[PDB]
């Protein structure tokens, strides 16, 4: 029953409420492969509490796989702690969570991975974000991003 890796994400968001935050450290990235957005919304806050005593690079490596369920405020907070999030992780973030981010905040989030943002300018999260930004603000990234 529970010995299989797909077990965790076979449970509904309602059932996943009872999962104790003290378990989250043993949850491997493999276990979250089959988890929908409604389930990550329930698991992320439990990951937040389970890892909150950690900081920077050590915190990010642990929270990475759960950031799908992270709201805007937590992404803003993450940008301040000079964490260098890779573009593949950023492209899996929920659209609603990314849109309100500023040019400065996205550049701090991605660090040197911002250099690859031109190739994703038409793709799901980044496209939506670009359409809400002033072209003059996009110009400062030095990528030649278009459509503000």
């Amino acid at each position, epitope marked *: 029953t529970a010995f299989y890796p797909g077990y965790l994400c076979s449970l509904s968001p309602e059932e996943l409420s009872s999962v104790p935050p003290s378990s989250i450290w043993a949850v491997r990235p493999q276990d979250l492969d089959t988890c929908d957005p409604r389930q990550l919304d329930v698991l992320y806050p439990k990951a937040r509490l389970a890892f909150q005593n950690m900081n920077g690079s050590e915190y990010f490596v642990k929270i990475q796989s759960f950031l799908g369920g992270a709201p805007t405020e937590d992404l803003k907070a993450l940008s301040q702690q*000079n964490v*260098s999030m*890779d*573009l593949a992780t950023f492209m899996k973030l929920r659209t609603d969570a990314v849109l309100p981010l500023t040019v400065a905040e996205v*550049q701090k989030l991605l*660090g*040197p*991975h*911002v*250099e*690859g*943002l031109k*190739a994703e300018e038409r793709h799901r999260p980044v496209r939506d974000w670009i359409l809400r930004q002033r072209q003059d603000d996009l*110009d*400062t*990234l*030095g*990528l*030649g991003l278009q459509g503000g």
Partner: single-chain antibody
Amino acid sequence: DIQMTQSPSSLSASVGDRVTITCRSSQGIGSWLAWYQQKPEKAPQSLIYAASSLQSGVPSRFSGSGSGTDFTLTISNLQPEDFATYYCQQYNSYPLTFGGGTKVEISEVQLLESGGGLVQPGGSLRLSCAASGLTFRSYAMTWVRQAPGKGLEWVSGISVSGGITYYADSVKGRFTISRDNSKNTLYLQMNSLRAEDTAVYYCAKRGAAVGSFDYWGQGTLVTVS
């Protein structure tokens, strides 16, 4: 200044071999690292940015790994076109710094530098770089130089807008960088030139305001004495 150390310094291999080049930084640089390939008598080319991201056009048999202070460039299935010198570069903080290089023995964009030549000590010279096949207006630019027998040294950089300029300590107060977007031209005004300013001067586009050098010109030779 962050110090970048490469191993081995020299290396002999055959077609098909796996080649492993190490790059070590004196401080943490996170993932702010690039790898460059320089073939004999040619300008450098971008391989890697952000420690592990392949530059467009670069074969998959190149891969970068690591973060913090420990970085690796692995060349799988070494080909004859891989005969070259490989440099790592941190762009975590100014001055931008290169490793001493590793000798391995066995474009939609165009940047044309001009104005190189022989100059008397204490003399003046203005380098030009004509960029084409890109929206020049929208990219940050730098000058990098290579003393005849030596490795790469970052000289100065200019922002997208031209409002912010950066210089290496060895050229601050003597060198001025500027841009004319209407002429698609990057300039380096060089004053009070010394024997140690002798080098091939390369024009380079930055992949981002804070990014690697993704395109290089063929360069222009300046000699002093």
